[PDB]
Amino acid sequence: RVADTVGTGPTNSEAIPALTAAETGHTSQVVPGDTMQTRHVKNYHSRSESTIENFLCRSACVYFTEYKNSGAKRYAEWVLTPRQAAQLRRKLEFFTYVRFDLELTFVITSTQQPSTTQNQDAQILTHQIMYVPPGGPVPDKVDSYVWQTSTNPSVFWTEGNAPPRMSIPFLSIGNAYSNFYDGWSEFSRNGVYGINTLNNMGTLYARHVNAGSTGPIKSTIRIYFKPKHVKAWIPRPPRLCQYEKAKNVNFQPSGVTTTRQSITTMTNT
Amino acid sequence: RVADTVGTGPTNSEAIPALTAAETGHTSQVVPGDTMQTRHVKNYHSRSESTIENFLCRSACVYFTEYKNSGAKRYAEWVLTPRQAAQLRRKLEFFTYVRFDLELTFVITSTQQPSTTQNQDAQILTHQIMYVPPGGPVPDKVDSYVWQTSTNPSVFWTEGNAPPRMSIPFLSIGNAYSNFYDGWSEFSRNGVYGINTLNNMGTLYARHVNAGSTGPIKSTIRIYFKPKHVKAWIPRPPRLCQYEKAKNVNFQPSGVTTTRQSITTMTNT
Amino acid sequence: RVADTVGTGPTNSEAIPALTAAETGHTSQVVPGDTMQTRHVKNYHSRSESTIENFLCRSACVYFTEYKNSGAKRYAEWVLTPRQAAQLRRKLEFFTYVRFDLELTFVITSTQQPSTTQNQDAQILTHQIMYVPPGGPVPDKVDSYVWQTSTNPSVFWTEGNAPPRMSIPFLSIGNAYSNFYDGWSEFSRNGVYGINTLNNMGTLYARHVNAGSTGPIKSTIRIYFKPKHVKAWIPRPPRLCQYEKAKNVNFQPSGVTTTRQSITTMTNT
Amino acid sequence: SDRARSITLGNSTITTQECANVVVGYGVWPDYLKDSEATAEDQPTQPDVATCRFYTLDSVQWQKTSPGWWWKLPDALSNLGLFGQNMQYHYLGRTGYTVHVQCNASKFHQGCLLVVCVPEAEMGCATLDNTPSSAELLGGDTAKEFADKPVASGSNKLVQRVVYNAGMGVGVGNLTIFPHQWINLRTNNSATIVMPYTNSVPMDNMFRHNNVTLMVIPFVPLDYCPGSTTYVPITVTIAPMCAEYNGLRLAG
Amino acid sequence: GAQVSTQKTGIHYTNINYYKDAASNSANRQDFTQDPGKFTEPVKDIMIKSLPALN
Amino acid sequence: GAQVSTQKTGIHYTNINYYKDAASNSANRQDFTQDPGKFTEPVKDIMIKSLPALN
Amino acid sequence: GAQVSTQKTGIHYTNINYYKDAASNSANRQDFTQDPGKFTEPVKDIMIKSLPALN
Amino acid sequence: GLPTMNTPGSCQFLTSDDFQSPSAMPQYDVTPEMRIPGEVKNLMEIAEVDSVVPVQNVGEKVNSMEAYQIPVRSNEGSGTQVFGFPLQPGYSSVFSRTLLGEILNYYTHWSGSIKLTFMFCGSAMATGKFLLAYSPPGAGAPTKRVDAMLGTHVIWDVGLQSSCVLCIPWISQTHYRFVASDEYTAGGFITCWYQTNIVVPADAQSSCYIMCFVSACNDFSVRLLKDTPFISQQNFF
Amino acid sequence: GLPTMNTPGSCQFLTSDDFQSPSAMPQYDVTPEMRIPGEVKNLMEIAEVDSVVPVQNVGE
Amino acid sequence: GLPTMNTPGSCQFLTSDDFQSPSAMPQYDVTPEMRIPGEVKNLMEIAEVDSVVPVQNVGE
Ligand SMILES: O=C(O)c1ccc(NS(=O)(=O)c2ccc(N3C(=O)c4ccccc4C3=O)cc2)cc1
Ligand SMILES: *C(=O)CCCCCCCCCCCCC
Ligand SMILES: *C(=O)CCCCCCCCCCCCC
Ligand SMILES: *C(=O)CCCCCCCCCCCCC
């Protein structure tokens, strides 16, 4: 981790650690004792908060969807990506290739909707969240045969309990997920660009298992991703521009930095 | 599990691994190095997802019934079979004989029913699910003496808790359950065909133990089967046709495959 | 801990333990056997309730705020300090420098607010409390992108469960928190006095994650601090005056003690 | 002494008199694929000295106003030699590179270039609901150029090229985490980077994925006084390293 | 009476059985023995590849 | 990795730590060391009772 | 089959794995190995400070 | 069963918690790893890498490459300033979007030494000397060369070897400093002056540029994760 | 009793979970096994068996 | 799972309780200690120190 400062006295020598050539593409290994007289300091500081498995291993909200126990929008569909929401996305894009296991956690809430229904009296709601791996049947309605879940992972959750959670393995067909792809999936080099199937990891469906009330209730499910067991390769400059789309790297040109008055001024504007 | 590819150089030999006779009823044991030059590859792939105790060991919804705390249909009756619902049924019918222990899990939900009752105010519902082994008394009403459960297994469940579950042994009188029976139970060879008593495993009853509200509440119980400790013998071709009935193998004649334009075309229709 | 009394007989000696000079700034070490005849007593008393890690290690309410699921004041903001509430503050100010780990515990309650809304029917409330370390984005509304919590610690709590709690390390940039600062942060010695950044430890935000009801509900969150793993240095006279402000040591001049009739009277007034 | 260098690959030899060392990747030198990382079961083709040798690309003038240039690596050598004839007959291949950029000018000239090899440099589009076409990203040994002003948004399949965002939406001054050297005209006249194969798969098709992009970007413009040479070229030379190919089929 | 077994990896876990019936135990997930030679090669005579199947 | 320590009496208890941070541990209640001699008797010369404080 | 490891301090804790998959385990927090020499000093020749970078 | 009791914090979702949870796909074997070049195991690996600093950033310079360039020229006399900016990465306009500075808007606290490198990009006939100074805080910025040579400084002579390093020692009352602006944990000021004029012959440009780089030393550390103020959204993308 | 704390994922029904659960019929002894020909222990056993491919499949 | 039973006093917040609770900031290393003069470990240390008594306290 952090290294200890070593004491140094006066010099007058043919050594020149301060002078260097930065054209070589090498970062100089100069320490403070080289350029000045220092005392010996014992350092007890650590670099344990800046591990990759600390930086990326906190739950982050990626998406939220709504669905109702009446009318249209009886269920919610979402294709799992960590690219809908800015904050998690930016952190993963300090790297080109990442490999991790997910832990999904769901915060499901319900809100009574305005109506003129007399004598509402909800029963407790039970919700079903169904993970469907790539390919295979997709529910086209609440009350299809796809919600049987004979071989699709699924959880059921009654209100007023702890959030559900489940672990997902590393599901890539590649040896790492890629956050950037500089190519086309077609051999003609036509169609969509930057689209790849290394990051597929199914679709998520959510519904009510009962309409408890005679009146309308609308639920909101929020999905949290927590990377764990992380490994990362090839670091990249942070994103400077705001994101526009979830499938593209497209951007509006942004200035390098914010301005200031002069090149000698000691304040920001 | 998966085997390692072995490197091979040029050949010119009296050996003929590629030529075979497929009339012998033997599947050829040719590997890629036989027919071409290969490199040596180490494989670290496994066949752990295709074990029979992975394939069949996930909960699957088999049935659901409804019952009310008022009027007619005060309780639900169901004879335990894994043949009401398509998805579980198809998986078990990759085999002729299977032997397993069940784990039943019940998802019980309640929904307020429309009425003109003023000042409804439900108390928490408690439900009783009663397993009755083959033979013995059958409840003919809610509030019969059969719900005493002196010697019938039974569970009680109050709303807003975890789903009940219970394990069931292997209950066959035979040494395995049979998924197919090519015979009659009668010695005359009259009556129903394909009916056998190796797969009996009682009837399930479900009711409300209280009507909490002054208004009407209707509950829905969903039964989930999870095979475990599985053993299976004699594999069979998968079902090609849609199922029609739960006691018969009856089918509508279906084509072998879907069509395409030509025998040289590289797309489906 | 407590020491044992030692027996003593008559004296007539050139020893003078009773006579002392109190000008020396030394507290006399006279024990009762010095000035009179005593018996030998075994003491089994202990000083275990007057440890610093007993005195300061009990939960104490520091603040409470309110927020609603409708209208203005959708969330609550509070900068963490143990100086809003008198009782905890006074105990810590028996010392100049303290060092401890917090344990936060939150008691969150909700109260229905009067309205003319017909057919209210609340769903269970879920609350989010978000800790934001010094610097970084601050939510400016309910439904901002800051409540994503990609890297800010956060808890979610559904009603009718145990209070949340979390431990916080010792977060000072100094080697101890200071309860007193006799200086300015500016080098000019202008601006606010007694203001220092050794005691920064972020801001706390709290909101509803759903409005469950059609009618208005107002919640109250109460924050409890419990010091633990305490170390304390340099003791100080207790506060004699009532506190006025949370950032100042400002006071109204108070008499030394309460009065009594005479210097020979044996009662208080 | 430390400034002289010679690199020999196949027929080719490069010699420089001013050299800033050689940068090697992420401290990984090109190697052939192992049999404990391989997936494909056929015997590789390894042409050796018919693929792994220096190829010069077209030169491009450095002017007082020039914004920069980029070349996408497997598709800038795709028409050249037997490197180009092995990647259209095979489905797979993997290779590292040695990139050598030359630019010589007098001791009365000044300027500075940044030479970077950027893994998977995916580049934005001027219009925000389209992605670029393959005729705006890929040259073929001709360099594509950046712009100094934003590309206007039409109904475009154009690339958003601006030097200061690098066409990727990042600060251009932070491209120094990628293997890099500077050509500063008062010091050195050449730069050498040796890239290893970087991908998340052991081999990949090279006619629809570009796994590296070379960019040469002026940070200090070219300047000289009247009477000096006004034409200063920048030549790029690229050699494959440990090329393999697998999956022999028909051309295309 | 705890069993310690290896986990599925690209460590170890501990398990105690709590019930008196062996139908209450968790599913057997880690049984990987197999023998495809009953369904492939059910022939009485031994087939050798690199020799005629029929003489 | 359990610690066994004595209880406060006029027996013993068992404790296991469950978390990887040492700020998650329960409070230290049983530390009874003390030294009042910093605040009482801070004088440079050693005071002996049964002798004049000032000669 | 318990592991006993040291906590982060300015003691020890106990952990048992309960599941048969190694993707169910808690996050690895205490891996502190590092090597900045891939990204700093990627040069082929060894640079010695206190000697010219270019002769 | 076994008598148990629940404590505060049961049935909560803390986003920083580490607990075990069952897999939704059991007995799934993951694909093998391959060695990919340039594995990262710490973010202080990639904060020790030089990154061009946009010292200029005055009006319309941030929308060009002129931000990174620092003017120097032949002028009458010497002892005129070249640049000045305050030490406070992850706050200052100059340093907030540098590679060092963006691994430091995810943290509340920072400690250790920082090394600036300068690279002279004139012609090879140009020559000059500079005074690269750093002043601890408590007396404001130096406004003359003679005020600036009372702090830490290095005199840089340009010849062969076209770079020089000004290493900024850690001189602080506290062990850590805030990333965000506070006057209690003020950093000091970094300034540059002509020690000697830029001297050129005829037919060589008398205007030259300097480029600046910044990286952390090996005694550097960061602490206390937080959200960055530099990414936003109004809706899902 | 023993101080405990519940974590996320308590009182959920995950369909892929493996936990122990009490038997509804305790001390029930199951019928003996017999050796039945052709036991299957993996599905890659029965994917290694030749199967006639319908190459033609054009209209009727 | 393991059969358990809850006792009275579950889901209460007693202000005097000592239980362990997870940290909101994991792997956070705290600043080193320094020796500061006059550490206090008991309050009977600082009750053994002489303090001027206001014996008179009659009116003003
Ligand atoms: O609270 C958070 O966790 C949360 C809040 C905001 C957020 N990101 S955001 O870009 O600020 C954002 C802000 C609002 C919405 N949004 C709505 O508020 C809404 C209401 C009704 C339908 C659809 C939507 C919907 O897309 C979506 C994203 C992420 C998470
Ligand atoms: C062998 O079983 C003894 C090993 C130690 C057992 C620890 C038991 C854990 C708690 C009891 C589980 C009891 C289930 C009925
Ligand atoms: C040393 O720690 C081993 C002694 C026996 C440990 C019994 C553990 C009790 C149950 C597990 C607690 C685990 C907390 C993460
Ligand atoms: C090694 O694992 C044996 C050490 C003692 C184990 C105590 C186990 C604690 C209670 C059981 C946890 C079981 C999780 C499935």
Residue numbers in the entry:
A (entry chain A), B (entry chain A), C (entry chain A): 13 to 281
D (entry chain B): 10 to 261
E (entry chain D), F (entry chain D), G (entry chain D): 2 to 11, 25 to 69
H (entry chain C): 1 to 237
I (entry chain C), J (entry chain C): 1 to 60
The authors write:
A 4.0 Å cryo-EM structure of CP17 in complex with CVB3 Nancy (EMD-0103) revealed that the site of binding is located at a conserved VP1–VP3 interprotomer interface, but the low resolution of the map prevented identification of the detailed interactions within the pocket. We reprocessed the raw data (EMPIAR-10199) using RELION 3.0 and the resolution improved to 2.8 Å. The cryo-EM map shows pronounced backbone features for the four structural proteins of CVB3, and well-defined density for CP17 on the surface of the capsid. Three residues that play a key role in binding CP17 are conserved across enteroviruses. In CVB3 Nancy they are Arg219 (VP1), Arg234 (VP1), and Gln233 (VP3). The Arg residues, which come from neighboring VP1 polypeptide chains, are situated in the deepest part of the pocket, and in the high-resolution structure, we observed that their guanidinium groups form salt bridges with the carboxylic end of CP17. The Gln residue from the C terminus of VP3 is positioned at the entrance of the drug site, where the oxygen in the side chain engages in a hydrogen bond interaction with the NH located in the elbow region of the inhibitor. In addition, there are other contributions inside the pocket such as a cysteine residue in VP1 (C73) and hydrophobic residues (VP1 F76 and VP3 F236) that interact with the benzene rings of the compound, contributing to the overall binding energy and specificity of CP17.
The arrangement occurs because of the similar structures of VP1, VP2, and VP3, which all adopt an eight-stranded, antiparallel β-barrel fold despite having low sequence homology. Recently, we discovered a second druggable pocket at a conserved VP1–VP3 interprotomer interface in the viral capsid.
